[PDB]
Amino acid sequence: LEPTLSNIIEQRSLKWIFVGGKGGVGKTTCSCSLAVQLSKGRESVLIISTDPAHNISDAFDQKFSKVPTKVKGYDNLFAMEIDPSLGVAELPDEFFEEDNMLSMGKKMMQEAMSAFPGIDEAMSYAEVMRLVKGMNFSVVVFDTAPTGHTLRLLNFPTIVERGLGRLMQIKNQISPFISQMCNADQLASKLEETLPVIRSVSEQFKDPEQTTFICVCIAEFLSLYETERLIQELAKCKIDTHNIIVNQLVFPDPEKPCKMCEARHKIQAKYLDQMEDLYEDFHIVKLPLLPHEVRGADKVNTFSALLLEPYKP
Amino acid sequence: LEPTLSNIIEQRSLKWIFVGGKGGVGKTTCSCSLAVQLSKGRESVLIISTDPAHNISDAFDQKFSKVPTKVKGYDNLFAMEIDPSLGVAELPDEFFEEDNMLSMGKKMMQEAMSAFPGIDEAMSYAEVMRLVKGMNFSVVVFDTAPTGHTLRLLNFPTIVERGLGRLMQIKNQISPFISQMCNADQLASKLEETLPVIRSVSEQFKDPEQTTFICVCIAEFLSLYETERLIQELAKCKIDTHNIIVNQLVFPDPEKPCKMCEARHKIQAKYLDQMEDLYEDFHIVKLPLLPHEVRGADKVNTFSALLLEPYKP
Amino acid sequence: FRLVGCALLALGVRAFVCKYLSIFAPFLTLQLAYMGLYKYFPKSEKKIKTTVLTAALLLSGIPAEVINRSMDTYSKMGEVFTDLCVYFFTFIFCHELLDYWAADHWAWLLVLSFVFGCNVLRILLPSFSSFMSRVLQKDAEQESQMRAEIQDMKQELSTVNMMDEFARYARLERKINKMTDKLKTHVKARTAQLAKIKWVISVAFYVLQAALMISLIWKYYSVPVAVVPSKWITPLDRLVAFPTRVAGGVGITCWILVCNKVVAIV
Amino acid sequence: FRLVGCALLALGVRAFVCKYLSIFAPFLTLQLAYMGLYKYFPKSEKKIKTTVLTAALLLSGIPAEVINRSMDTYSKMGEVFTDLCVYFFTFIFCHELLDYWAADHWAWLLVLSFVFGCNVLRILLPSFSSFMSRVLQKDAEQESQMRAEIQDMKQELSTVNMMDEFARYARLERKINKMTDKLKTHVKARTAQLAKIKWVISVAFYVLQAALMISLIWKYYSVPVAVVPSKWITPLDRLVAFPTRVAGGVGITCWILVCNKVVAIV
Ligand SMILES: [Zn+2]
């Protein structure tokens, strides 16, 4: 197919680019370099960091916050770290565990008049989405946490939707009953202004032409199997995925300097043969291993350059 | 503590040595070298291979079967590959999923008069254990499959035990009832001759002085986390574990020949610092990476030598 | 536990059957309910489960305590209505017993036969479900073959390795997942079809039984059905004497409600 | 569904109450059961669930069909026994009704009061469970504090990273797992203690009610209790006339069995 990430750059209809992948892979650097490459073609790029360790702060040697802030050295790029995202994504762990279609709304309402912790999650997520859509960013690059998956969360409030539809159906009956037997408005209000943005972002997520997922792995059985499971789970949710980036590749020179370089090269060659056999319909972006002394903006620029065009010594 | 595996060799009370660990780690070579090292001190060593790929056949370039067969080049070592082990360990997947204390016996009896697939598993496992104990091997080294855990299976038949106790309790009542209202013996028989060996092997498994577990991983977050979960699950089942072996280590020479060697060395150094901080009460056996051309018996001997005494260039 | 109180009240009513020493017959029921409430005061076991209809009304700002008292008093009036119904049934029993030692008797027997017939047909509707059990059997062969295919794929995947042949293992896992998803979709489609069929047959049964009931009313609206002296049940006599000054359209709903209650909570 | 047949048979018996046109009274019950079986022939819905006691007997080589017929005929004789019991109850009802329009009457009332009192005390034993509800409240504070500790550890673990600080994350996960295991052990210990307490109080209740029953027998073994003409129930009269040629020790077990059945299946 193609060993580069040019299909993402040339697709100007993209508006939600997610970068996932579990394990020890340095996926934050890859996603930051992808955002840097995108900044050369778009008018404004945003980098959302849902990881708890704040890796993009170290990547750009700057300090970010929960609001979009200009990164130094670029005019289009903006960065934002939202720990509230993971804080409110840990809460629906029960919904993730059950993943039902009838009782999850019952659980949500039960916790609503018992502890009120879930509609607060909906408000926080809607506020983040409203800020993102109000700043009017061309593309948003999400650094999804290595553990968990908050992408499916948007498919949950459909129970809220038809519950509100039943509410509208019984609206013409509650009022005569209320008159017969005789705050109310704030709840229905906050629902009414927090639903449309959720629906816009959920409809954008399920559209393959304005939402993509890049899976980041390394040449190994464990990471390969984890990313295969991730791809299967993502396809089960009807979410587009077209590119995977393999990191920590050795690519030894023909000088044969080290035996261990060729041993690791043979291991990685086996794993990449398995990957290419399995992923003939994907974009396999092979990213080599950079020096320890090359850390920071220089490595981000190098990764962006190698993302634009394939690397081969 | 100690960076070698000498505690296993000097413990002459061991009779069940398991070698576990998921992922792409070459744990079969490590376990085969451990068995080779054990053959130098004991009178007879057996190598059981529960993996489906028959790796010890390639390690010794010989062909093995379901019976213990002498391996060439050694006088004490014996090898055996038992695919029936995994075939009958896939069946209790339902019991593994539920892991209950009251209803699993109900499920077992239901499948017993519905399909009879579980008592057949018990017979197969008891037959394997009876062969192992009848050939009178000093030590048995299990190559547990990377997926699943058949070790907990021995803790399941305790429901069978107290069900049989209730059977003995109602034995004095069924006979007068049988006389009042008026094959039977084969079922109770086969239970009676398949219980004691199961109990002997289960009691030996829970004894820390005659059963040990070696966890095999590599210097990486994914494998480290998988082995941490494995150790926690093993300790939850009250099963001894004292040694972990890390594979595919680079150990670059002070000549600084390759930048990528030092980059991988820094990554592995971070992961080993995390491991040693977490595992001060374990034996961390650091095994380097061997040449691709060194494959077969030579690499087994090299790994055995490095298991006996620590390797440091 | 509510049926325990219902049975206790019913046995009390049957103990007070045909007893005219006390004129205040409905009051006798009032102290029956008072004793039941007093006994339930330290024995108020109940189970409250989350529903869907309450979600919309909770979102309408109505206080939760108000909704709880609304539902529990609605229940309370439900069982007191059923208990008054069985009270009137026992009074009718007294009436035909004293008649034994009379078009009212034939009317009573006919309305009883009609309501029992409707109820037994409603309860044997699951036996009438053979018309869809045949479709279940028709789809059973497809389900059996496409689960045998699942078993074959699963055993073949168990045969293949995972380390050195991950491509084939992953492809077979994908095929197994797709076929199992198809199985789940077929199962859900079967469940939805059965539920829709039950709903439509149930509403047809409801409309036919309503038509039978209204035909019975048109037949006996001008005919006395249950004749009792006025001063016996005079606190509520004007309500029960709905048609032609006799216990009619209230008696019918008493019969159907008590029969449905017993054959449902049974 | 079995209670549906029980209610139908009971209403049939109450329809045949005090009816001496046919001498063959127990036979009338025999055709009642025959009609029930005929109606159940196309309506034989039942649920069979796996138990523990059947495992040992299945392992004893007894054929499965033999065990199934044993259990289902045991059930059948159970409900026919309860139905014969309510039949005798209705005959007694006829007897005191004809008496209304007599030491047997006081004996009947006394044995009834005794059996209802025993049954209501047995059913309010859960209300008597306050002596262990107090221990539950005592342990509630320990449970609450040691789950608050769980919540604190969980939130602190959520705060800490996992990549660059895996040592602390793993140690905190170990602590959380250990404390949750302690919670599960405490919960299981509480459940076992409650179950043992219920078992011992239940066996004490059984022995005290048996003592009360045998005291009642010693009081009324030589006293007639339920007097009926012989030829009315003569097919089974010799069995029911256990003490002093009167319906005694069979009547007591009839009363207790029917009351326990209604208050259990209720
Ligand atoms: Zn090198």
Coordinates of C-alpha atoms in Angstrom, one line a residue, chain C residues 8 39, chain D residues 113 115-125 205 259 263:
Chain C
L8 CA -55.2 -13.0 55.6
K39 CA -49.3 -5.7 61.4
Chain D
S113 CA -55.4 -20.7 67.0
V115 CA -51.3 -23.5 64.4
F116 CA -51.9 -19.9 63.2
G117 CA -49.8 -18.7 66.2
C118 CA -47.0 -21.0 65.4
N119 CA -47.0 -20.1 61.7
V120 CA -47.1 -16.3 62.3
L121 CA -44.2 -16.6 64.8
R122 CA -42.3 -18.6 62.3
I123 CA -43.0 -16.0 59.6
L124 CA -42.1 -13.1 61.9
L125 CA -38.8 -14.7 62.9
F205 CA -38.2 -23.2 66.4
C259 CA -51.1 -23.4 56.5
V263 CA -47.8 -19.0 53.8

